[model samples]
Target: SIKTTRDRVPTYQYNMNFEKLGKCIIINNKNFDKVTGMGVNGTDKDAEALFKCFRSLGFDVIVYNDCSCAKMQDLLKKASEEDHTNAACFACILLSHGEENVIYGKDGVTPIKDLTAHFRGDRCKTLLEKPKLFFIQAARGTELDDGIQADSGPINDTDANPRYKIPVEADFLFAYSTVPGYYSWRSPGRGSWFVQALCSILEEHGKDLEIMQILTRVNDRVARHFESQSDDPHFHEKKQIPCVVSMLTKELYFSQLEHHHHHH
Candidate 1:
């Protein structure tokens, strides 16, 4: 079992080559059967935007669409098993229909934790002490964010390590589209409110800002600038707020110096 450590350690920094940042996995679930509900339309826009965004930051990006629960688990397990000793971080994005604490997997629902736990330090040794990020663009509950005119919103582990080791789940950050027991808004034509803001802010300030700073901007943009408009009475005029839960042991700046060095 992983133990929590109170000792203060030096924060990890990413001052290396962009190409060494590591892999980013994006699972965009756009389709579902009648039993599950209508397929998520325009998620491709989010997928494409994210692919471009992360790639620009130098991560090896992979996009998987319409995956089953089993496929989701298997992919993460395989990824965690791979050697990431040379990489600085790992990221995953999930775009799907969801409910409280769970996201749909084409065929059915799956606990979000099940997918993320695969990357625990003891289980994925190569990723120990490295940042593991998850961006989830899905509703957390059925309750809509019935337009308040403004405003809004918003792991675990195990292991066999002795010596009172730090939690295997350290250094993980989860960016959820909405707070617990609330709905997340998505536009069929424009993509999700959270993701569109995310891509925009990352593009504008990614090089200069720390990861949390960029995400705070994302939350602000979503909360203050965006709102849902729809023809369907039940879905029209809604709003959303993004939330970030971070366990990072350090401040993560993509390092403007790296970008400057690359051009020089």
Candidate 2:
């Protein structure tokens, strides 16, 4: 298929009219019922930051604050029902409590797959072959990262960068705040390390680099630049890493679609 030089570098080129508001939702769950073990503080700042971030990236950036399980499902389901023939892509950001495969609504837990099932190729034909981006700022498990601290440890991990790659029945990317079975760190006022780094990285490099390239920088920044500071020794000075899962078919630059298109 890639018989020519330009053909080898496949990409999604979007040039459209109107707001890309059929998608791009932010679910910021700040307060929760006393029973759910859910209410995570300080998600508001992350939510507002994301609004500006994605909006700058050219998405319309609609936010749905503090929806319950059924409400979240209904929101995304109706979102999938939207017409995306003119839409460039889809994105959803979840700032909430989480488990291995589930993210909590104000009321309780909902399996993530259940929410995203709306947009799969078969379920949503309009988005076929188009990229779908999901940003999850939630912990997959409860394990805290006791980062390298207290004393000078050997720096054996001098791993060089050049890590990163996609598929149809694909094109879906999940950027998790932390690795599986680990806690995601957040500050009371500033917001989450994953989100803060993400917003900063996306703001700086998103316009120039591909999506994967941008994420690697985010990972490195979060992993080294910040550490947890809990009052308890078990939780203080902890380090965390971001996670990414991509089903993309080719390179994705968050940059605006460039200035050349053919008309018939």
Candidate 3:
């Protein structure tokens, strides 16, 4: 028997007013220690560009610079603790130097999971079933992606409950700057390639395209057009491909009514 489950499951409505939809927390981890040699230059541009992009999309944006791992964890914990019942979604951008599954603070490394775990549906109930977006601009590893002038482009859970329980981690989207175990390209003068392309695409199509669709274009732009120009041999002539990890159960369109109404 086909049963209608629409009424029981939470449905995400398209947000016409960006600012009213939610708050976006941007953690720009730029500087690093002399011992670690992991300081990121030209990241201010990335931060500024992303701030504008999210703000235009109707998010209340807050920028935190050069955070320690402890600080990062604390901030996310605080955010996750807040009541988000009125917000349609949430977003966080981490700009840092990183390794596989780990991101650096000004002082040292921190497991990425430590920060994200706070927003689990079981923990942050107000945001349960609401979109939680993360943009991580960092190297997944130390390997450089030397390419041959070619173009390119780029979760679940269970439970037993008589009433039915949505997964704690549902509706999360992670947009990584690079594939696992690969270097994410960044320009000391310009910004990280992934973020630059992301801002450009969002600025152009955020109002018109679905979230995944816009990210796909961002993947295309970064893969096809951008490359590293660093003078150092180790960092020169590199390429990057952004990665998107989505657990959304529905299609997401940011400016749904505004765009549709314009066409009518």
Error of 1 at 170 (Å): 1.2
Q: What shift in Å separates residue 202 of candidate 2 from its native position after superposition? A: 1.3
lDDT of 3 by residue, 1-264 (tens): 698544532234544343367889999877777666664466788899999999998889999998988999899999999988888888999988866567888888887777788898889998877788888887643434356764541211122121111122668888877432223465235676788888988899887888999999988887875455467454333455676787876667776443332221
lDDT of 2 by residue, 1-264 (tens): 646445421235332333462367999887777788543455788899999998988887889888899999998899888888878788999888766567888888887878887788988898877788888887532333357676543222222121221112488888877422223455235677788888999898867888898888888988885455467554343455777887777677665555454433
Candidate 1 lDDT over residue span 24-92, tens digit each: 999998887667754545589889999999999878999998999999988989999999888888999
TM-score top scorer: 2
Alpha-carbon RMSD of each model: 9.6, 7.2, 8.9
Candidate 3 global CA lDDT score: 0.74
Show the lowest summed lDDT stretch of 10 residues, model 2: 158-167
The residue pairs in collision within model 3 are 18-58, 19-58, 121-168
Indicate the residue-level lDDT of 108 in model 2: 88
RMSD of 3: 8.9
User: In candidate 3, residue 195 scores what lDDT?
Assistant: 86
Q: What lDDT score belongs to each candidate, Candidate 1 first?
A: 0.74, 0.72, 0.74
lDDT of 3 at 174: 81
